[PDB]
Design a protein around this ligand. Structure first.
Ligand SMILES: C=Cc1cc(N(C)C)nc(S(C)(=O)=O)n1
Lengths: 415, 556
């Protein structure tokens, strides 16, 4: 039972065809979950069985969101989203609030059920095909395509925009000091109110959404105050060797790509000669001052950096040991928009991959909150390792773009 | 009989027309038999004689001259296939015997009129036109077109599978305890029923299919002894793949070779090491299914190695969902690994070997990791879960490796199995510079234009060396410099480069490389008792680096 109301015509970008992306292998519980989910969605007409003469495909799998509840379905539409025409003013939805990042707390509501009530353009359904795999390939895949706005597709939030506005109009009248931002399947709600005061208004908003057909899985507190940058620091030893000094100059040099005002000269001075590494050197005064100099220059945030809404956001991550990580986000090399740290361990995960999959979600969320786009990730890990394992720890309804890197000695430079 | 089932709509790729390939003539003994086989086919609906208005053609052939193999026609759809639309292959991979569960009663039904009794999309038939060669020229040959899924046409398997699923669906609902698996023309049906009732549920299935157009002969015949599903022997408590026999001969046709690759792909699922690269070479570039393509030296060698492998049988046990999967790995001599997956000691489900390499520089501990990852993924495919691992690596070895690796790594639940050659890190880089070890500042340079270079060092103790080099690169000279210092020093040494390139490679503790240079560096690194490697910016003061630069760069 869906709404006979007109569909918006949807096209792919000129020259581009649909996704033909292979399904990766799934575990049994994930399969049984999805077969269950889909069987139900098909009875309700949300999706329809199709055959092999439809050439397109998008991978699907399953997750457990807020507090390990029960199975949610997640289609990886990254490929379709890239291939899917843009929406101009309804660009990726709406404008992005600059004031969301300034609230005491922000909660993240899963509003994806809403989409399943708008029919999807008929000539476009075919590009939404996905195939549930079978164990040992006994069965062959169950193939389906969508009849309604799918979760995860960038088209969905943009086509449902005008409905969303109307649905949230009431609640914004009664609360003008609340900021609300929609990113894909998600709703970001931020007040500077007070943990209990605030949280009641989430359940309050949830109830309002619930009375509107928008079922909402049963938040997730995050505080864009508690967000600061990782300052670069130098050591300040009592005894400086040739090696010590040598490392230091190395750091200072790399760091001369970010701050063009630092000098290293007075320190190379000290190294004049073919000395043994162990040899303790006493610092000049004209050199030992140079240190506190740069130490100050590096003590004040980089200046003049410029978010550009047109360029990608890029994210680098560095494994620092100790269950601790570092990341920089930026659009152009050395002009960083943010830098931070993500420390963990001492709790429940001696798992290196789980820790990185979690860091990627914190960075993506931060980036949504601040700029309303997800960064493309440079991930310090082998493709096969990450591919065999990431989904086991994924809890977001979105998926950022990523690639796999080859880290050098710029690790011991971010701490 | 042709099935009542709805056809699946079929399209040519956009912008492409239908085939228009012309018939070769020949022996008017091939024309007989063809015409016989054809009239027979036409009698049963599979094909229709058509009208010359139809512009399309694809070639026909006659094969297996007697040989206790009467005749048989042979349509070459290669040209049509390239013109027909792509299809989504639903299956992630082909089913493995070890993935099967134990069942009290099992039947395998054969689908003979498999393809030749599933309707083709009416609109698409015109593109499957072929002619039987016109002896003499006062009129053309006999024209025909298919009404069902043609043998070698690109869509038949996908559509056939699709169709079998719609057809079986009713019978499955009515019968949820019974499991059915379709694979090509094999239909596996298993249950835990008594042989009396089970055999009875089968007769019902045979009728069900019969209503939908599909035959299924009184099976018996004279093949009943062993019991075969897609080439596997399914016994009550275990499965077996009997040794496969590859034809021997010298005259090999395109068709002969197309057949061979298929039978090798089926096989690589069960056996490790099966190669097809050389054989596939022999194919593309040509035409004429029946032209003899003589085997290259390499191809001949691939086939020899393939027989040697397929020489022995394979045996395994069935899967029991109530027991953990265990997987055990052994190192097998330079990039060679073996594994066994089992649930109960000595009753193997699946055994294999991984022989590969990471990139250009690798180590046993990386390889083992990737092997664990390859196995994890196989397991999820075949059984939908991951094995508990038994690895020939000490917990402390892995502990120190993953602790210090700049990349995230992980290995699932595992325990140490003290077995063959244990997996070791062969040498370690020191964390801190070494007291009273001599300090070599190495450097290297090479004229990109001329290829001539110099590699050498300089040490705190006044030691020095510069070496003239022909046809190398900035990057090789850097590596040669480091090697110099390893060669010319004692058991303890502090090296210092400005080479990002070089330092990275050594950082990852490779114990193996495809670079001769790098392998010599390794053998040096393993002799040493203490090595400490260090990076510095090039072209700075840095008293050490400055000098080695001057000397090593008289190549401008
Ligand atoms: C060529 C594929 C193939 C297919 C097959 N099946 C699927 C019955 N059996 C064999 S065999 C007799 O060589 O074990 N081969």
């Amino acid at each position: 039972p869906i709404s006979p109301i007109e569909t918006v015509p949807v096209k792919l970008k000129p020259g581009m065809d649909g996704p033909k992306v292979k399904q990766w292998p799934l575990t049994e519980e994930k399969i049984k979950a999805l077969v269950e989910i889909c069987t139900e969605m098909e009875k309700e007409g949300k999706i329809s069985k199709i055959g092999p003469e439809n050439p397109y495909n998008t991978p699907v799998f399953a997750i457990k969101k807020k507090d390990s509840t029960k199975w949610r379905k997640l289609v990886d539409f990254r490929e379709l989203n890239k291939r899917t025409q843009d929406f101009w003013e309804v660009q990726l939805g709406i404008p992005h609030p600059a004031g969301l990042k300034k609230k005491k707390s922000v909660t993240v509501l899963d509003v994806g059920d809403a989409y399943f009530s708008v029919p999807l353009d008929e000539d476009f359904r075919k590009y939404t095909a996905f195939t549930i795999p079978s164990i040992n390939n006994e069965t062959p895949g169950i193939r389906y395509q969508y009849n309604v706005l799918p979760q995860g597709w960038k088209g969905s939030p943009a086509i449902f925009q005008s409905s969303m506005t109307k649905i949230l109009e009431p609640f914004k009248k009664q609360n003008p000091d609340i900021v609300i931002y929609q990113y894909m399947d998600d709703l970001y709600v931020g007040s500077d109110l007070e943990i209990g005061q605030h949280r009641t208004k989430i359940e309050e908003l949830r109830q309002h959404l619930l009375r509107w057909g928008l079922t909402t899985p049963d938040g997730y507190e995050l505080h864009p105050d508690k967000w600061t940058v990782q300052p670069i620091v130098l050591p300040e030893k009592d005894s400086w060797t040739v090696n010590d000094i040598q490392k230091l100059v190395g750091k200072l040099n790399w760091a001369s790509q970010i701050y063009p005002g630092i000098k290293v000269r007075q320190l190379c001075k000290l190294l004049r000669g073919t000395k043994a590494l162990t040899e303790v050197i006493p610092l000049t005064e004209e050199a030992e001052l140079e240190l506190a100099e740069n130490r100050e220059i590096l003590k004040e945030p980089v200046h003049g950096v410029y978010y550009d809404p047109s360029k990608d956001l890029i994210a680098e991550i560095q494994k620092q040991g100790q269950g601790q990580w570092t990341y920089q986000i930026y659009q152009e090399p050395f002009k960083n928009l943010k830098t931070g740290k993500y420390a963990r361990m001492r709790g429940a995960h001696t798992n290196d991959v789980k820790q990185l999959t979690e860091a990627v979600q914190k960075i993506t969320t931060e980036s949504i909150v601040i700029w309303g786009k997800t960064p493309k990730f440079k991930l310090p890990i082998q493709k096969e390792t990450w591919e065999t394992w990431w989904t086991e720890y994924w809890q977001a309804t979105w998926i950022p773009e990523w690639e796999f890197v080859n880290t050098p000695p710029l690790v011991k430079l971010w701490y | 009989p042709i099935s009542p089932i709805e056809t699946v709509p079929v399209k040519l790729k956009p912008g492409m027309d239908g085939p228009k390939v012309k018939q070769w003539p020949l022996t008017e003994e091939k024309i007989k038999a063809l015409v016989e086989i054809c009239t027979e086919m036409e009698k049963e609906g599979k094909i229709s004689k058509i009208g010359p208005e139809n512009p399309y053609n694809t070639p026909v052939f006659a094969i297996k001259k007697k040989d206790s193999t009467k005749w048989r026609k042979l349509v070459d759809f290669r040209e049509l296939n390239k013109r027909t639309q792509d299809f989504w292959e639903v299956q992630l991979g082909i089913p493995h015997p070890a993935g099967l569960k134990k069942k009290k009663s099992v039947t395998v039904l054969d689908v003979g009129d498999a393809y030749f009794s599933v309707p083709l999309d009416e609109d698409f038939r015109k593109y499957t036109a072929f002619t039987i060669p016109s002896i003499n020229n006062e009129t053309p040959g006999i024209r025909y077109q298919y009404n069902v899924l043609p043998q070698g046409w690109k869509g038949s398997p996908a559509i056939f599978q699709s169709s079998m699923t719609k057809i079986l669906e009713p019978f499955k609902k009515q019968n949820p305890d019974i499991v059915i698996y379709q694979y090509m023309d094999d239909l596996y049906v298993g249950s835990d029923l008594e042989i009396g009732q089970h055999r009875t549920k089968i007769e019902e299935l045979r009728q069900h299919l019969l209503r939908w157009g599909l035959t299924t002969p009184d099976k018996k015949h004279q093949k009943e002894p062993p019991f075969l599903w897609m080439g596997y022997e399914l016994h009550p408590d275990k499965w077996t793949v009997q040794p496969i026999v590859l034809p021997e001969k010298d005259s090999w046709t395109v068709n002969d070779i197309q057949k061979l690759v298929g039978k090798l792909n089926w096989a690589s699922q069960i056996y490790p090491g099966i190669k097809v690269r050389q054989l596939c070479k022999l194919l593309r570039g040509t035409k004429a299914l029946t032209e003899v393509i003589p085997l290259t030296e390499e191809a001949e060698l691939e086939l020899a190695e393939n027989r040697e492998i397929l020489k022995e049988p394979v045996h395994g046990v069935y899967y029991d969902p109530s027991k953990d999967l265990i997987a055990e790995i052994q190192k097998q001599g330079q990039g060679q690994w073996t594994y066994q997956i089992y649930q109960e000691p000595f009753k193997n489900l699946k055994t294999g070997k991984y022989a590969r390499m990471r990139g250009a520089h690798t180590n046993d501990v990386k390889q083992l990791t990737e092997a664990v990852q390859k196995i994890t993924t196989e397991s999820i495919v075949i059984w939908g879960k991951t094995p508990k691992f038994k690895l020939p690596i000490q917990k402390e070895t892995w502990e120190t490796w993953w602790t210090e690796y700049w990349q995230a790594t992980w290995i699932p639940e595992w325990e140490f199995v003290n077995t063959p050659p244990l997996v070791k890190l062969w040498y370690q880089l020191e964390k801190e510079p070494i007291v009273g070890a001599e300090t070599f500042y190495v450097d290297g340079a090479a004229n990109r234009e001329t290829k001539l270079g110099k590699a050498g060092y300089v040490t705190n103790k006044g030691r020095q060396k510069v070496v003239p080099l022909t046809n190398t690169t900035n990057q090789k000279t850097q590596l040669q410099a480091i090697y110099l210092a390893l060669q010319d020093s004692g058991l303890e040494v502090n090296i210092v480069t400005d080479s990002q390139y070089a330092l990275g490679i050594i950082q990852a503790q490779p114990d193996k490389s495809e670079s001769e240079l790098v392998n010599q560096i390794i053998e040096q690194l393993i002799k040493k008792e203490k090595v400490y490697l260090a990076w510095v910016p090039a072209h700075k003061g840095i008293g050490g680096n400055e000098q080695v630069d001057k000397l090593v760069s008289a190549g401008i």
